[PDB]
From TrEMBL, chains B, F:
Organism: Coxsackievirus A16
Family per similarity comment: Belongs to the picornaviruses polyprotein family.
Residues of the full protein shown: 567 to 862 of 2193
Role noted for this protein: Protease 3C: Major viral protease that mediates proteolytic processing of the polyprotein. Cleaves host EIF5B, contributing to host translation shutoff. Cleaves also host PABPC1, contributing to host translation shutoff.
Subcellular location: Host cytoplasmic vesicle membrane; Host nucleus; Virion
Protein name: Genome polyprotein
């Protein structure tokens, strides 16, 4: 969860709305196991 | 330093290849010593042995204890599943079947495993297939393991059978039975036949009381099978799956099931017909 | 010198002049989780004396016709003192227990309770009697709280297994003519190093009168049974807001 | 590190680029919630857009600590303090800061 | 390299890129009570990470006409997380604190808050105006809880003493053109080694705008002030049932 | 061992008998160094000294710092109480008086003590007695200290004056003034002029808000006095009590009281007439 | 902006215990990821059509 | 001391006072082809300073609604200066690159460009919308020359792949409030030691506004983006007459 600790403050002359980009990754103690097929790809139809 | 207050197991393993010997003993007549008297309230079993209660001879016992090692007790292939793909009927005229892996459907093996609370092991699975009457025909089959989260095939020719990552086995009903080794796969350190709890947080309204006793750490996914072909096969197929535990370790022994099993996922028993563990007789003074 | 005993932990002390030794379940003392076995990376909180102390729960009354009772751990304490508070505020919990069951009568009463600890005490239903109904026990039965629950079919421990073999588990007996308490020290047992104190009960404590209470009329008839337990080496992790279930 | 689609709204689907970043703006009330999402990396949701998420979907199990880095792209003249929290299992989305 | 900083304690971390050093009240770091000074004989509980961590209280809004606020310690946390629970279950408590007050604006705003810690902050009333009425502050004013309270007469700190001299106490200033936070580390101060977290507030935190907030219209007008505090070396003793007051 | 995670003050005292000396300095012209610039936001006071802002001569300063040692600031007898026993009126035509010990009734001494939060010390009490017009007569008096819990005399001849255990002083109004030493008596490690709290648990209803700020650790009991006799004395008596702090230690300095005092037990001030700490003028640009 | 991923680890953001991690990294070696037979072609030779 | 930088190569020098370090693609500096890897037997020509220098291409204008641009290498330079001439007269070419993308605004503007290098950037078509048409990109789209081209569907990089994962490639961001340029050093990457500078583009440079440009009206609205690149270790072989394609 991301909360406003104080407030987004800006002076006269600058946008009152801005954006944040979130990047994610694994740390050094990360490992995976039991290789399997992904749900994220499907051959809905024939590839010509 | 300026704050002083800021500053195990009494039993282990022995190798016993043979039953204990019997040392010769003679008569013992005296006060103070009384090995025959015990106090079961302590929780300990009696420490008395033959030589303390009678006069014994010497016996060099060479009876082996090897056959009761849990490994020899469990490493015997047993039936854990029967899967059928008939050609006519409401069953599976589709040419494929997806089976949720649950081995608690057959009593013989189940009762043996439930002797323990936790077990960790590897396994050898053997797949015996034939027509329902035991005959064999030149039919090509494909068995595939679909781990939790992998797409389950939805048809005899679903893309999932491309099996690019899942492990699959292709064998003929005429070849001997397929056989493979499976490692220990739980995310826990051991499979557990009993889980006194719920899988998730929340209120446990009577609507979802089927959650009770379900341990995700034992849910290994799906086992899928199909006749390999774009067209339907004319043969009904009967697949029996056998499992052989190997490289096993077990913890916490418990009372053995003494009421017939009713369901794969719980210990429910038939309350109107509660069986006594032992047969009965008329009098306590007669055989 | 084996019949007398004192248990002191935290700001609490128990005494007994009619004990029958003490059982250490499976021969192992409870201990904090070691770095080799651990997996969660956050430094845990180990409150010590505020949670590793004796708590006495509600007392039960033993009658000539009682069936027997049971309690689940750590359920019994999830809402008691500082222990409960820690169990609620943390996702992860782990501990051992010292269980002390009390029951005294007179040299003229008789009866015998079997006091046992059964790991992963999963309950079953009578399946609608006929066995055609796949019913399940309601929360209140699987996690009865500090009041505990009553066995409906002690002979099969409400789980299709023989009471006759329960002695294969850590236990003691309270045989009125011999002792007036049972003491069992239980180490953490689970397939994971830490777990939820709310979703998973590590073991159950059963107190079953195998040899029924009896006495001549005129003798005191109110013979209670009291359970006092103490967490040992309680550790917690995964701090967040409090959750009751 | 790869981009997390925190702003995965149904109303974004036709202007997908808008999913690659979420907004912050001058609040009128204190303690407001800015965004929320599950940390489950192999689950459907924001993580699916990351190379991490896609790859761990080729495995049944995972273990380890994750890391999310937030980059502020407002103007240099903008200032502010945010509280970012990870709530381990048990409690649904925290009601308030 | 003095303007940047990170505070990590428990499962919490604070960052700031516009600091102005850190104050250690009276030059002393908090520490657990040593055996020479202690008097209570029971072994205390020192929960560690479950209570020595950062807690963020309700935010206040700074207006061109704000008078100033104050909070009392340990009152603010008596009902928050595991710390509060421990404070309620024990008669005796003792700890230090890390106070971090936050307030950021823009390079075009201006103003200056004085952030100070005043030991034994006893409040007084205006005595019915005329001074003939010996009135007293109500519980809600002496122990405002986590919401804190508002000063009615900052010039005399609602206690007949000059704000002008408050800098004789551990403090920092949040001068918008210079920094956006204040950090003060406070050691336990009292005439007794441990005390009640309910009946006695060791010190008060005052945040007073000595140089009023100002900015040209069009600039952001919601300029909040947030207080985040962390107990340090929290110790408790005299365990019993929970008491709220 | 198998669990790794289970494994001060940067400033101290110096003796400064004399004010710091001034070392001679010359001109300094350069970049990088800038002692005149400070950052009061830090909470620290300026470190700049004369030699950094101007050219100085050498001055061997021998001014002593001794008179500002807290001991010399406090060890001066001050009035803490005036007790009267008149012969006619509603006051005390009883020949005796019981006074609850509270020294906060006189501003001069009070403001000095309130400069600190905690103070620990011993004290010398001097008792100056005379008729209300300053004249002296051959009257025998008895002053007695009645610690908390000791029976308070209820009359000029109550048994309590037997003073078998309490300490009492017998002196004539004509003898010089009686004087004694008193040790540090709080059950706490120090007397505290400010106690932000309540003496007991409970709800703090507006009915008992007079409890706020009352620290029992400062309540030393009662001081009783009487003319020594079974019959009433014909003389009105005026007793002034002076206290001299000695062997003192003090902690935590605070702002000095800047509004007149209203009550012995709290810092209440007259809100309709809040005095400014400094006098005023018309313009900030004129003296 | 540098193009680098964050170097921060658990111990820098929170108080950690010691954990002797024995989880293997072998199954994610590209060799084990790819050396699994997959379908690359289906060829048919019918008798009619 | 990491924000300031100078790049000097050939008769050209670049300066920047708001950098954010420099990226060396896959951790490798460009280098001439070694004799073990080489296969072509003719002694190559290594012009040095006449071709390993900075060339500035046409500038693009960043608008609140820009989709993003891309350039292909070595296409961009096949017709510029001595480098292009060498690329035309020789069958074989090989080199690395130093890519410097420039974009400055004001402390009141905002936005963020992702600057990345994608080896073998093969483009795809939208397949006639329905996906039944096997259309292909025209020369002008696959090799846009020094003017570069515009992405029609940045979210999938006009190639059926997620922009969200492009950071898996050598890159930097130009976040207006932080820096005003990106610098990436790219080594030769291919399955062959030398190749045609005309038929094969080794990699593509993408500049995509992931966080859109914004600013209050009244502020400068023309915010250009300029690309300056320098071949490094350019080598050529297989001399013959000049060929443009
Ligand atoms: C290509 C052949 C694939 C064969 C794969 C078989 C995998 C089966 C693994 C054995 C897992 C042990 C059984 C675990 C849990 C029990 O079934 C539980 N009672 C289910 O709730
Ligand atoms: C025979 C002569 C007896 C004289 C005894 C005098 C004892 C007085 C001891 C001094 C105690 C210091 C004053 C302590 C506390 C303050 O009065 C508090 N403000 C009262 O609430
Ligand atoms: Cl197929
Ligand atoms: Cl029964
Ligand atoms: Cl997941
Ligand atoms: Cl005021
Ligand atoms: Cl007398
Ligand atoms: Cl797009
Ligand atoms: K033998
Ligand atoms: K001197
Ligand atoms: Na014996
Ligand atoms: Na300076």
């Amino acid at each position: 969860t991301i909360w406003y600790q104080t407030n987004y403050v800006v002076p006269i002359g600058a946008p009152t709305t801005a954006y944040i980009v979130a990047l994610a990754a694994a740390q050094d103690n990360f490992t995976m196991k039991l290789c399997k097929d992904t749900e994220d790809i499907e051959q809905t139809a024939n590839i010509q | 330093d300026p704050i002083a207050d800021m500053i195990r197991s009494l039993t282990a393993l022995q190798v016993l290849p043979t039953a204990a010997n019997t040392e010769a003993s003679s008569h013992r007549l005296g006060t103070g010593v009384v090995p025959a008297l015990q106090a079961a309230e302590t929780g300990a079993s009696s420490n008395a042995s033959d030589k303390n209660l009678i006069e014994t001879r010497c016996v060099l016992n060479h009876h082996s204890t090897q056959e009761t090692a849990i490994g020899n007790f469990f490493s015997r292939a047993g039936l854990v599943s029967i899967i059928t793909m008939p050609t006519t009927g409401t069953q599976n005229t589709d040419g494929y079947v997806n089976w949720d892996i649950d081995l608690m459907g057959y009593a013989q093996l189940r009762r043996k495993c439930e002797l323990f609370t936790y077990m960790r092991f590897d396994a050898e699975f053997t797949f015996v297939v034939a027509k329902p009457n035991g005959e064999l025909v030149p039919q090509l089959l494909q068995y595939m393991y679909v781990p939790p989260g992998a797409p389950k095939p939805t048809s005899r020719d679903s893309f999932a059978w491309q099996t690019a990552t899942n492990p699959s086995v292709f064998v003929k009903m005429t070849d001997p039975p397929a056989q493979v080794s499976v490692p220990f796969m739980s995310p826990a350190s051991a499979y557990q036949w009993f889980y006194d709890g719920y899988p998730t947080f929340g209120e446990h309204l009577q609507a979802n009381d089927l959650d009770y006793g379900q341990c995700p750490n034992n849910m290994m996914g799906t086992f899928s099978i199909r006749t390999v072909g774009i067209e339907k096969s004319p043969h009904s197929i009967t697949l029996r799956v056998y499992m052989r535990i190997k490289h096993v370790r077990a913890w916490i022994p418990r009372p053995l099931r003494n009421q017939p099993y009713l369901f794969k996922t719980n210990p429910n028993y038939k309350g109107n017909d509660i069986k006594c563990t032992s047969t009965s007789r008329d009098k306590i003074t007669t055989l | 010198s084996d019949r007398v005993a004192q248990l002191t932990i935290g700001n609490s002390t128990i005494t007994t002049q009619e004990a029958a030794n003490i059982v250490i379940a499976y021969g192992e003392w409870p201990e904090y989780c070691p770095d080799t076995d651990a997996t969660a990376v956050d430094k845990p909180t180990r409150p010590d004396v505020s949670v590793n102390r004796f708590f006495t729960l509600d007392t039960k009354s033993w009658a000539k016709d009682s069936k027997g009772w049971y309690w689940k751990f750590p359920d019994v304490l999830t809402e008691v003192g500082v222990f409960g508070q820690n169990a609620q505020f943390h996702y992860l919990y782990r501990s051992g227990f010292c269980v002390h069951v009390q029951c005294n009568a007179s040299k003229f009463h008789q009866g015998a309770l079997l006091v046992a600890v059964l790991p992963e005490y999963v309950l079953g239903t009578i399946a609608g009697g006929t066995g055609n109904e796949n019913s399940h026990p309601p929360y209140a039965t699987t996690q009865p709280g500090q009041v505990g629950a009553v066995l409906t079919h002690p002979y099969v421990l409400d789980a299709g297994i023989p009471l006759s073999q329960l002695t294969v588990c850590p236990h003691q007996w309270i045989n009125l003519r011999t002792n007036n308490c049972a003491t069992i020290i239980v180490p953490y047992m689970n397939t994971v190093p830490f777990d939820s104190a709310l979703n998973h009960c590590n073991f159950g404590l059963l107190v079953i009168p195998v040899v029924p209470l009896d006495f001549n009329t005129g003798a005191t008839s109110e013979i209670p049974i009291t359970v006092t337990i103490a967490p040992m080496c309680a550790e917690f992790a995964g701090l967040r807001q409090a959750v009751k279930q | 590190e790869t981009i997390l689609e925190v702003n995965n709204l149904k109303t974004n689907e036709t202007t997908p680029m808008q999913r690659l970043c979420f907004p912050v703006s001058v609040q009128s009330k204190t303690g407001e919630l800015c965004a929320a999402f599950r940390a489950d990396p192999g689950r459907d949701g924001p993580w699916q857009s990351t190379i991490l998420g896609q790859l761990c979907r080729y495995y049944t199990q995972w273990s380890g600590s994750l890391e999310v880095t937030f980059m502020f792209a407002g103007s240099f003249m903008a200032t502010g303090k945010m509280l970012i929290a990870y709530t381990p299992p048990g409690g649904n989305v925290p009601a308030d800061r």
